RNA sequence: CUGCUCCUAGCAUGCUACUACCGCGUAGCAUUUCCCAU
């Protein structure tokens, strides 16, 4: 027969390859949520400022700006820590961020992967904890 | 197929300790022999 696609099982590289898919799509989906936010009610200046940088260097600038990109980095390692195995992971997000839609949340996963994996994510196998006792 | 762990066996290496003998080196103690012509 021939296969249309997707990974394999029997190989030696199915692990890393599905860890690196887990964070281009979380980073995507982080990119998505900051820019789909109306610029006049945001919170002080940085965060407006930082987002307007990133429309330019997204759709504007040809080739790349390093200096963002490690600003960027930071910013994520800020507000958005995760911990990756193969297609698994959890997340310790700020929480008055995502209230305003400035980093990630389920609906933008939801969004990602219904236009970019042709799947729909039902909300309802997701898990969201508040307490950080009971891990 | 990758990663983690347990257990077993063997090997090999390194290191430590013990025992024996050896000789060395040092020190102490003590003795045994005592010499001759062309």
Redesign the pocket.
């Known amino acids: 027969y021939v296969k249309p696609g997707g990974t394999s ?4 590289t ?2 890393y390859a599905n860890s690196v898919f887990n964070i281009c799509q979380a980073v995507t989906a982080n990119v998505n949520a900051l820019l789909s936010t109306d610029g006049n009610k945001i919170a002080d200046k940085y965060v407006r400022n930082l987002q307007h940088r990133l429309y330019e260097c997204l759709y504007r600038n040809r080739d790349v700006d390093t200096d963002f990109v490690n600003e960027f980095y930071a910013y994520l390692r800020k507000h958005f820590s995760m911990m990756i195995l193969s297609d698994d992971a959890v997340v310790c997000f700020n929480s008055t961020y995502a209230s305003q839609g400035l980093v990630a949340s389920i609906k933008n996963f939801k969004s990602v992967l219904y236009y970019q994996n042709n799947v729909f994510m039902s909300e309802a196998k997701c898990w969201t904890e508040t307490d950080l006792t009971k891990g």
């Open positions: 099982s029997g190989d030696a199915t692990a």
